[PDB]
């Protein structure tokens, strides 16, 4: 068992090198078949809270908050604010969901191993785009060159291509009921039939 | 007891002319019912809101735009007089069937 | 609303009565 | 018998901020204590404040010489004597509320009283037991005994005379106050009774009236109050005895607010300093407060801030903060608008309302439904 | 009528002595700190005039 | 038709109320049943034709 | 003295007993379900007493026909010793010897007595597994219920897994209804004790609850799923579930049940930005107990990070121990949305440098992005104006005359006529 897990920590942390993310999904779920559920036999690993971390940043990039909390259900409760390497991915989730992103982007440079950087990049577009999101559902007409400084594009070519990959568009000046009577009469049949055909 | 008596009539008289005036209007500035009716601003924007809080005369009275506004509520509400009284009614009528409930 | 609820709690009682009736009918048969 | 409190609230039970721990109600207490010598008064007294002074052993001696003298005399008229019913049993009792109530405490007076109860037969017994044990219980913070005695007078009781009770809501005034019974039923039998009093051992007529007053005036902000308490014979007499109150009253009923803030802060205090302070006077003035407002807002549908601080005391900044705190606590029916500075009322007109209850009272009855019928038939 | 026992029926304490044992039915707003009135109203009209 | 209705539910409470203290030994009950059949059957027709008219006159 | 009491008490749970073994037998007689839960439902009560001398009486009293099953019992079994069969040889029917073995479980369990508990109900539901017959399933459910008790004391719930998912399946062709019910909860359960919840949320979502459950099971169900909800970010759904919960709960027992569903509906309720209301803080059987989520409350009304961490160093054992730590931690990072959710709910306008200064949240800019992210989900109904800094909340239109009434009222139609037709199809008259 020791050597399989070595076998699947070393062919996670190749996927994370490979920089391919379909891959590092599969990889991770095995070694979680294989980390910390009725084991109980193997001893603990140096890299057991390392990947751990890792796992949970990226459940974090893709918008996997619900699976990031199971996740740190998962892992016991002492190492969530003792052990670094999950201290990070929690702390920036709690950022993100307190909405201070300018905290997570502060924070982008605060890993505690270099084998974090890779979807760290992803999940800074991530929050970017919900950002966009949230804007789109929250302002009314919000002015191009706003946008363009608290969406982090610094590069006002870059907001544009953006705004271009989104619906959500420039507009003119860069500043981005009947009465039914069919199924409520449906819903009144229902009822007179329900009155009516015995019990 | 001739000053209470006349202060008395004085306002019984304010409310019958401001009650005889603004009948024409649905949205009248109070300066110019003040105007109308030859009394202070503040003063007759205070009766109206006493008048208005005694119920004995319908309307409201929009101080952020200096306006008074005149409507009248529907009749139409005592359908759910009855309604909402029945329910509260077989409220107790369900509790009596837990009673029987608490038989089986 | 009014009326089904009248006629919902009227049924239930008539389903209490039976409920009731039966177990009457049942414990006699003792 | 036992009337003013015993000084004991205002007597170093108000201390901090109210301050209230030595003045010349102390000296009063201290008076009321050595005519009829009493200990009682004196066990927080032998604990916390004048513990182990000369005098409080020094009235101890002759204290303890009377009470044993009177405890003597009792118990020899009970010996030699078989006095039956309402007799000198009853008397014993009754200096023993007089004596151990005021000389260490109730728990001897309340089982005499309860053997003289089982051996009497007449009714102002039970009552003088009910004011005597509320009147101690609310120095050693008692209601269950209050309550307890107060079923028995009116349910079982009540059936000879009448005429008693009434003012003995006066725990009402502090039983389920915060939310309904500082008001509503604290009022309706304090109306019912200001008219024919009869009851000068609890309390003045004066403090009476007052003690009406602050409770009807939540009970009824302006629900034609007038009919009971501003057409009213007696409490307008009184008033005219009493200008703080009566100001106080027709402030808010004449819509001064300016005037009705500063009546509502004195009230707030003189409310601190009472049987009344530590039950509900921060409860009573925000009551009032949002009370105030509600009627401001009434009659309006938008208001400048500006307008409300100039005519309601003062404070843009504090009725802004104000109206923030009691709209968040789901009371005073309005939308507060910022450097505007508009406030708006958003009052459902009787249909919404109606349909709002409808649907509050229906969703009640459809869970007790559904309850219902799933016990039932399995 | 079933128990629950799998939920551990959690034992309050010993029963120990509640804040007041009261019947007095409060709201949120009850537990918040304040500071008298008159002070208030004197403390935000001087500045004006008062 | 309503407030018919709500005086025979106060009925049918207090005769319901009886029901307890009373082993097997006008009905407010079937009068009731016989309000709320008349209330259902016009306000389902009435509601039924209005919006029937609605929708078949343009 | 202590002996006579003693005796007519063990004397009159026998009589219970014999009834209740009636009533068992009575039940398959007309080829009908039910007549099962009247002698199940009295099971606390039978429960409560189980002393060696009446259990070894009913062991020898229904009994006659002496087989190898009841021969595993007996040296578990004490008899006494200077101290009745109800009377033929006839065969003993499934569900008594059933009932009788499930009391005798439930007695070694009440004693602390867990691994020759483990093998008693070990061999007590190895039987039922072969049996084809309804009447058997209401006494199965228990059955799994008390077998899944056993093992949880024993520290050995991961093990039954596999065998509460094959009875469930079983359960499911056979178009069972408590015995799923029961076995379903018993699963989340299971799930939920090793924090497998990813996993019990698979097996919810394709699992359908049977609605003609009973009402403790369904409010089990509803805790178990509100939980799973909860800690799966799915706050509103999660809250609605556990006061639908605490509406199906016992009202007189379930005081622990109780207990941990209102601490669990407290903290969804404190996430959502929602105030739970200060009424269930004062009950006795829920007062000390919830003591810790009160001064936690407090801290977010006011918003007092420093009472709020103060309350958490205080009480993490307690918060640990109901498993509510990470929903605590999250919601103390969702403080500022509760305040928001306040702040939108009293003021109609108001600019960012207010919302900033009332929420001492230091900056403008982040005040802002504040508002947006709880604007973007249901939290808050707004509509930022960047442009100058207004918070406008959306125009509150009159509710009347907006089909919004028609739909909900169309709602409470369906569950009445619903409620009339169960009603009314479950008179169920006698043949004689």
């Not at chain 7, 209740?20 to 009247?38: I, M, N, T």
Request: charged share 30%; proline share 3%.
């Amino acid at each position: 068992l020791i050597l399989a897990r070595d076998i699947l920590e070393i062919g996670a942390q190749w996927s994370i090198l490979r920089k391919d993310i379909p891959s590092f999904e599969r990889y991770m779920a095995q070694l979680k078949c294989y980390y910390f559920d009725y084991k109980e036999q193997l001893p603990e690993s140096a890299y057991m809270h390392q990947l751990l971390g890792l796992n949970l940043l990226f459940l974090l990039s893709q918008n996997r908050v619900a699976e990031f909390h199971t996740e740190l259900e998962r892992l016991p409760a002492k190492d969530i604010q003792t052990n670094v390497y999950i201290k990070h991915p929690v702390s920036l989730e709690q950022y993100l969901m307190e909405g201070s992103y300018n905290k997570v982007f502060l924070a982008k440079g605060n890993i505690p191993a270099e084998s974090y950087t890779f979807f760290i990049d992803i999940l800074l577009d991530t929050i970017r785009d919900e950002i966009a999101g949230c804007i789109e559902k929250a302002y009314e007409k919000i002015l191009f060159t706003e946008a363009t400084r608290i969406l982090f594009f610094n590069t006002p070519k870059k907001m544009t291509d953006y705004a271009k990959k989104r619906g959500w568009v420039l507009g003119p000046n860069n500043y981005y009921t009947t009465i039914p009577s069919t199924e409520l009469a449906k819903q009144v049949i229902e009822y007179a039939r329900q009155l009516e055909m015995i019990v | 007891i001739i000053s209470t008596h006349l202060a008395k009539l004085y306002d019984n008289l304010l409310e019958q002319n401001l009650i005889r005036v603004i009948e024409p209007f649905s949205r009248v500035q109070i300066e110019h019912i003040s105007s109308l009716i030859k009394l202070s601003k503040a003063d007759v924007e205070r009766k109206l809101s006493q008048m208005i809080l005694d119920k004995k005369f319908h309307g409201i009275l929009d101080q952020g735009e200096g306006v008074l506004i005149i409507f009248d509520e529907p009749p139409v509400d005592k359908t759910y007089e009855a309604a909402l009284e029945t329910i509260q009614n077989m409220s107790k009528v369900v509790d009596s069937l837990y009673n029987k409930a608490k038989k089986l | 609303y009014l009326a089904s609820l009248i006629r919902s709690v009227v049924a239930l009682h008539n389903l209490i009565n039976n409920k009731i009736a039966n177990r009457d009918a049942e414990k006699k048969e003792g | 018998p036992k009337n003013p409190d015993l000084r004991i609230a205002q007597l170093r039970f108000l201390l901090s901020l109210p301050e209230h721990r030595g003045d010349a109600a102390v000296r009063d207490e201290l008076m009321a204590a050595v005519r009829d010598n009493n200990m009682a008064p004196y066990y927080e007294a032998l604990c916390k404040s004048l513990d182990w002074q000369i005098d409080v052993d020094l009235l101890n001696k002759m204290k303890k010489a009377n009470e044993d003298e009177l405890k003597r005399l009792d118990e020899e008229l009970e010996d030699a004597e078989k006095n039956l019913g309402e007799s000198e049993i009853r008397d014993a009792m009754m200096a023993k509320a007089e004596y151990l109530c005021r000389i260490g405490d109730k728990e001897g007076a309340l089982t005499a009283f309860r053997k003289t109860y089982d051996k009497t037969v007449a009714l102002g017994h039970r009552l003088d037991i009910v004011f005597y044990l509320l009147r101690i219980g609310l120095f050693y913070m008692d209601n269950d005994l209050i309550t307890r005695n107060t079923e028995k007078a009116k349910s079982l009781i009540e059936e000879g005379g009448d005429w008693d009770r009434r003012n003995r809501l006066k725990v009402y005034q502090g039983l389920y106050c915060v939310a309904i019974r500082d008001f509503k039923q604290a009022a309706e039998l304090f109306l019912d009774t200001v008219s024919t009093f009869t009851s000068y051992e609890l309390m003045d007529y004066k403090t009476f009236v007052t003690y009406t007053v602050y409770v009807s005036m939540i009970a009824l902000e302006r629900p034609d109050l007038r009919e009971k308490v501003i057409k009213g014979a007696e409490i307008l007499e009184v008033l005219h005895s009493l200008p703080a109150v009566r100001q106080y009253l027709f402030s808010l009923y004449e819509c001064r607010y300016s005037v009705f803030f500063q009546s509502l802060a004195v009230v707030e205090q003189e409310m601190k300093k009472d049987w009344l302070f530590a039950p509900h006077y921060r409860y009573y003035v925000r009551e009032m407060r949002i009370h105030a407002y509600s009627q401001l807002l009434e009659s309006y549908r938008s208001l400048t801030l500006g307008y409300m601080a100039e005519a309601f005391g003062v404070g843009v900044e504090f009725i802004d903060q104000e109206l923030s705190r009691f709209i968040a606590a789901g009371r005073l029916h309005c939308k507060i608008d910022k450097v505007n500075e508009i406030v708006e009322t958003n009052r459902p007109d009787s249909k919404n309302w109606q349909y709002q209850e409808t649907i509050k009272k229906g969703d009640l009855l459809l869970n007790r439904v559904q309850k219902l019928s799933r016990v039932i038939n399995m | 009528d079933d128990e629950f026992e799998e939920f551990p029926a959690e034992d309050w304490a010993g029963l120990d002595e509640d804040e007041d044992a009261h019947v007095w039915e409060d709201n949120w707003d009850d537990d918040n700190v304040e500071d008298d009135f008159s002070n208030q109203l004197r403390a935000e009209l001087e500045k004006h005039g008062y | 038709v309503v407030k018919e209705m709500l005086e025979l539910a106060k009925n049918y409470n207090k005769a319901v109320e009886e029901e307890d203290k009373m082993t097997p030994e006008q009905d407010p009950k079937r009068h009731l049943e016989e309000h709320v059949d008349v209330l259902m059957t016009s306000n389902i027709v009435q509601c039924l034709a209005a919006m029937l008219d609605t929708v078949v006159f343009k | 003295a202590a002996e006579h009491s003693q005796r007519e008490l063990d004397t009159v749970t026998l009589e219970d007993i014999k009834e209740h073994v009636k009533q068992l037998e009575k039940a398959v007689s007309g080829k009908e379900p039910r007549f099962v839960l009247r002698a199940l439902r009295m099971l606390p009560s039978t429960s409560r007493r189980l002393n060696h001398y009446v259990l070894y009486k009913a062991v020898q009293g229904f009994f006659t026909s002496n087989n190898a099953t009841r021969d595993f019992l007996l040296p578990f079994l004490e008899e006494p010793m200077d101290t009745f069969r109800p009377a033929a040889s006839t065969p003993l029917l499934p569900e008594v010897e059933a009932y009788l073995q499930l009391l005798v479980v439930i007695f070694m369990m009440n004693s602390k007595r867990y691994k020759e508990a483990q093998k008693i109900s070990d061999d007590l539901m190895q039987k039922i597994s072969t049996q084809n017959r309804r009447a058997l399933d209401l006494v199965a459910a228990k059955c799994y219920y008390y077998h899944a008790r056993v093992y949880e004391f024993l520290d050995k719930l991961d093990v039954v897994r596999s065998f509460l998912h094959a009875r469930l399946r079983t359960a499911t062709l056979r178009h069972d209804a408590d015995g799923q019910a029961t076995l379903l909860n018993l699963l989340l359960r299971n799930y939920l004790h090793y924090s497998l919840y990813d996993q019990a949320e698979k097996l919810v979502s394709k699992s359908v609850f049977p609605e003609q459950a009973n009402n403790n099971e369904w409010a089990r169900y509803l805790y178990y799923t509100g939980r799973i909800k909860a800690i799966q970010l799915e706050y509103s759904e999660a809250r609605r579930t556990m006061t639908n919960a605490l509406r199906k709960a016992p009202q007189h027992t379930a005081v622990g049940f109780k207990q941990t569903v209102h601490k669990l509906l407290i903290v969804v309720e404190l996430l959502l930005g929602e105030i739970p209301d200060r009424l269930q803080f004062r009950q006795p059987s829920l007062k000390r107990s919830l003591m810790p989520y009160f001064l936690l409350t407090q801290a977010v009304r006011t918003g007092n990070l420093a009472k709020f961490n103060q309350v958490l160093d205080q009480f993490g054992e307690k918060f640990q121990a109901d498993g509510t730590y990470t929903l605590i931690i999250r919601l103390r990072h969702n403080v500022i949305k509760t305040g928001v959710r306040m702040i939108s709910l009293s003021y109609s306008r108001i600019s960012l440098a207010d919302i900033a200064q009332k929420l001492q949240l230091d900056s403008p800019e982040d005040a802002e992005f504040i508002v947006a992210k709880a604007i973007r989900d249901g939290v808050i109904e707004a509509s930022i104006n960047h442009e100058k800094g207004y918070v406008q909340s959306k125009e509150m239109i009159d509710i009347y005359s907006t089909r919004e009434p028609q739909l909900a009222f169309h709602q409470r139609i369906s569950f009445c006529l619903d409620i009339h037709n169960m009603s009314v199809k479950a008179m169920r008259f006698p043949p004689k």
